[PDB]
């Protein structure tokens, strides 16, 4: 008997080149009012929430130094249909291009985001990335998005 | 009232990540380096580890950290949260540092066992105190 709204969704590994969130695969959940609509989490009541997510990027070799990975969680209000970033990070996994002389070493970069925010009833929350081509869901527990009311 | 636990690395232990015993209250126990959940319900689970290395010997270096669950019903290990990191950019002596932090909310069953593990305990860093840890909190 936990009456607090809460949610934990995971990437659909069958979706190719897309960050698609899924509910209730084993070890995922939507509880006490929280809903997944249009790939967003919909908040059922006004209040303070911890919001979090992780993504994992993987690349085979580094052909340009200028690769840029981003991950951001944003919020849209029912009152204003306008998007505001709550948490965002940026990462550049490459410091030197592969000297072709060398050959195809994989790199891995995780980004975890989390924090506490006042949200309003009906707010919609998105966790998005710039490069779904570089996403890695070869395994469970690598990519997820959740919230917990305080 | 609500079960909770926060364990920390034993810095004495060489070549494994050993969580320190008896911190952990209200039914939660540490058995066989795992946290044992005393009641079914929703839990926040979390952990952090810190890796430290001298120079980049070869870019082949991979760090992993993962939290898994074994259901008393399932008796099979399932990953809940997991991350991978490769620190050795522009690899061959400059020291490097890499943290990995994991956390999220899960429905667990009474008797479930939770593990927080890594692949390279040789690269663990205990120089920053209280910063390698593993915990849970019932909601």
């Amino acid at each position: 008997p936990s009456d607090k709204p809460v949610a934990h969704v995971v990437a659909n590994p069958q979706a190719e080149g897309q960050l698609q969130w899924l509910n209730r695969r084993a070890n995922a959940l939507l509880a006490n009012g929280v809903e997944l609509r249009d790939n967003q989490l919909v908040v059922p009541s006004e209040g303070l929430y911890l919001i979090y997510s992780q993504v994992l990027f993987k690349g085979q070799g580094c052909p340009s130094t200028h690769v840029l990975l981003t991950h951001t969680i944003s919020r849209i209000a029912v009152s204003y249909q306008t998007k505001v970033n709550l948490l965002s990070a940026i990462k550049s996994p490459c410091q030197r291009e592969t000297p072709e002389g060398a050959e195809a070493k994989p790199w891995y970069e995780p980004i975890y985001l989390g924090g506490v925010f006042q949200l309003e009833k009906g707010d919609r929350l998105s966790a998005e990335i710039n490069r779904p081509d570089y996403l890695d869901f070869a395994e469970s527990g690598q990519v997820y998005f959740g919230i917990i009311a305080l | 009232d609500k079960p909770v636990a926060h364990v920390v690395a034993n810095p004495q232990a060489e070549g494994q990540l050993q969580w320190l015993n008896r911190l952990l209250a209200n039914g939660v126990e540490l058995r066989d380096n795992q946290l044992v959940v005393p009641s079914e319900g929703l839990y926040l689970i979390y952990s952090q580890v810190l890796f430290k290395g001298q120079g980049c010997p070869s870019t082949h270096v991979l760090l992993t950290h993962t939290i898994s669950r074994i259901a008393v019903s399932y008796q099979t290990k399932v990953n809940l949260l997991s991350a991978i990191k490769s620190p050795c950019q522009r690899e061959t002596a400059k020291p490097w540092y890499e943290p990995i932090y994991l956390g999220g909310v899960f429905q667990l069953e009474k008797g479930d066992r939770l593990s927080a593990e890594i692949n390279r305990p040789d690269y663990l860093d205990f120089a920053e105190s209280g910063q390698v840890y593993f915990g849970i909190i019932a909601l």
Binding site: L50 | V4, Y46, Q131, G135, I137, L139
Partner: peptide, 12 residues
């Protein structure tokens, strides 16, 4: 001992 982290708000 107990440094700041993203979840601490839920444990007091």
């Amino acid at each position: 001992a107990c440094p700041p982290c993203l979840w601490q708000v839920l444990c007091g």
